[PDB]
Ligand binder design. Structure first.
Ligand SMILES: Nc1nc2c(CN3C[C@H](CO)[C@@H](O)C3)c[nH]c2c(=O)[nH]1
Ligand SMILES: Nc1nc2c(CN3C[C@H](CO)[C@@H](O)C3)c[nH]c2c(=O)[nH]1
Ligand SMILES: Nc1nc2c(CN3C[C@H](CO)[C@@H](O)C3)c[nH]c2c(=O)[nH]1
Lengths: 288, 285, 287
């Protein structure tokens, strides 16, 4: 009982992959994880098939609202997709080996690209709510201290022992998302910066917000990084963005408080603009 | 994963207390290392051993008596933790903070937390009292947070805010009321950074902690605060700066608990006077 | 439900006695050899080799370039025991297993521990192949729970609350520094802060920026727990890194840190390492 490794065996991921393949004719190339209140990104998929997480062997469940807890296969702008409508978080009590389960089943499914979205608190002063931020890079604070989904024995059928994360955010797609933005009719620029992961479930104090700023983080949240780390370890291309849902309180004067109701509501507002952005992006994702 | 205590556990404990004392506290006071001497002014004091009270962890560090004391302090109905619990003892934060949810079930509506702290701000001297204006939860950042796991709505919200954590009224009130202490040392206010220990900082660590903007360092307090706010208790916090953390390589001085307890003892009368004035500052239910 | 050392005092004693029974060596100095640094055992004389698998209670090393062997012998005429490879948190080990050998080294009679490691270079002044002497460390896993001393403290080993501000011996530093002018080079000995990070995956550019701005000169994934328990039981401690690679600092670079080049830089550094370690041995005080 000493060793802290994955509770999931390789054949565990396999069983789930298989089950999915025997239960849908869809064969996705792109997997999309929808953050808090962003569950609306599945609206535009055609010929859609829905599975409740409860149906899928080994799948965790979403306990936080509104993470719908459903897996959805569809086409989006020429491309076969699978979408996580709701994700999992460390703060819910899950070990990162659970949080990230689906990612390696996508790989066994044959997905070669993963897009990750999340709600995120604004740390950079010139962001505004409703801004989409292209995740250039992240800072894995839980990672530094030992909280990493890769911890334990490493299966080379999936990846290396020491996989480099410094090219994690696909540079090609950044450049393409950038100029693709001049193609939407938008007032605000597409935002770019570093996402810092923090465990939660409680929200930053003012001093904490200030370390995070000092650290160089542009946005804070409690997800996403584990998933990126396991994706890149199996060689998926990774592309991420955060929806800026609130500016995290950076002075003792404010009487504003960060809260879930407000973040879910910044999500419903933007999901429209979001889905379109994701839509045009699909035709930018490189073919297998 | 999850908190090992069911809701009934906290209830059992509260009811045990509610039927073994007639005291009904409004304020709960957690006593840090060398601050155990603050139960001394409790009138009509009633004392329990942590080992009597169902589900109570034990205090295993010297300077932590392992005793729960109900009484009145400068008129106010208090219950005091004479000794506390740390993460480095091998306790999950859901044990470290356990009493706090119980106090809430007792009807306590205010929590004061006290600790010893190392001084990061060069302006601080041993003996100072630093009001906890804010904290940095370094262990929180990576998963060690007492709220981790399923949330019980009966206590609070899945995502509670912490930027309002330390009552601005009670701090400002404490700041003005400080001239009654007859002191020449000003009253300090700054940031507490929790660090898990049990080993003391390197010079290099001291320096990250400084440049992270923190004024004092300890290994306690933050989890308790977090769960108190989760259930809506008013929170006041202060630190006794017991040592100045080592910030250069040519000093031959080094942090030790003995110096910590020694400085606790030195300031025992000044704390007691300060905490007394503080009971006059808490709003009534 | 208590996070706690899984080893009793008796376990550390069972292991130490076993070594004492099976070897005639009585080591004064213990050396932990990191990734790709195994060849430091080469210059040991009258050597005797134990596979970790033979040693009661010894963990095993699963990373490549960590041989998994305990080697006794003399080096520059000093009685050493060398760990041929070590253990890391990322392997799934609790810090109380990672550092297990150190207390047994202590029960063996060892009074000095020298920790060695590979490290990514953070300080722009460092070249691949430099030896940075660890003047100090930053213990990030320690900041948030991960410390080998967590749980009940055994007072037979040391304090409930030990100081680390003096962890790396000043006198050994200075002696090592001034002794460097011989089989020295046009390249100086480096000195600086090791930051420990858990891994197993390598730093992003952003993470690399936070480490730099935290004051840290080199990054690795071990060592610090070993140092903490060494000082717990009052061993003199000396540390150094081999800068095996420069951590990626900007987004257009196409280089990526990889294990293979960590090990290569090690084999490339063997001779200079050998020379240094034995010049170090001369700088270690006698009982
Ligand atoms: N840590 C943090 N996370 C977020 C998020 C992202 N998630 C939103 C949800 C809480 O509303 C958690 O799952 C984290 C939005 N804003 C913030 C913030 O200010 N802070
Ligand atoms: N981390 C830290 N804590 C303290 C404390 C607070 N407590 C003192 C006690 C060890 O003496 C621990 O339980 C933490 C006083 N001084 C210091 C210091 O220099 N550092
Ligand atoms: N974190 C980190 N560690 C190392 C190390 C030290 N060890 C090398 C090995 C990965 O090859 C791990 O055990 C850590 C060398 N280079 C680096 C680096 O760039 N980064």
């Amino acid at each position: 009982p000493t060793l802290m490794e994955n509770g999931y065996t390789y054949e565990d991921y396999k069983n789930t992959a298989e089950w999915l393949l025997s239960h849908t004719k869809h064969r996705p190339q792109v997997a999309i994880i929808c953050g808090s209140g962003l569950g609306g990104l599945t609206d535009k998929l055609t010929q859609a098939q829905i599975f409740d997480y409860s149906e899928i062997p080994n799948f965790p469940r979403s306990t936080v609202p509104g993470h719908a807890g459903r897996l959805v296969f569809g086409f989006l702008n020429g491309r076969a997709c699978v979408m996580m409508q709701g994700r999992f978080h460390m703060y819910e009590g899950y070990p990162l080996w659970k949080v990230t389960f689906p990612v390696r089943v996508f790989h066994l499914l044959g997905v070669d690209t993963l897009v990750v979205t999340n709600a995120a608190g604004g740390l950079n002063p010139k962001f505004e709510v409703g801004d989409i931020m292209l995740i250039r890079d992240h800072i894995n604070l839980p990672g530094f201290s030992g909280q990493n989904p890769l911890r334990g024995p490493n299966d080379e059928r999936f990846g290396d022992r020491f996989p480099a994360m410094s090219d994690a955010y696909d540079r090609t797609m950044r450049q393409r998302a950038l100029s693709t933005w001049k193609q939407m009719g938008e007032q605000r620029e597409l935002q770019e910066g570093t996402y810092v992961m923090v465990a939660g479930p409680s929200f930053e104090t003012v001093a904490e917000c200030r370390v995070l700023q000092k650290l160089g983080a542009d946005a804070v949240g409690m997800s996403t990084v584990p998933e990126v780390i396991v994706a890149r370890h199996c060689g998926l291309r990774v592309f991420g963005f955060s929806l800026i849902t609130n500016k995290v309180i950076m002075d003792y004067e404010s009487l504003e408080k960060a809260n879930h109701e407000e973040v879910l509501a910044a999500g419903k507002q933007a999901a429209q603009k979001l889905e379109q952005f994701v839509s045009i992006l699909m035709a930018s994702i490189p073919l297998p």
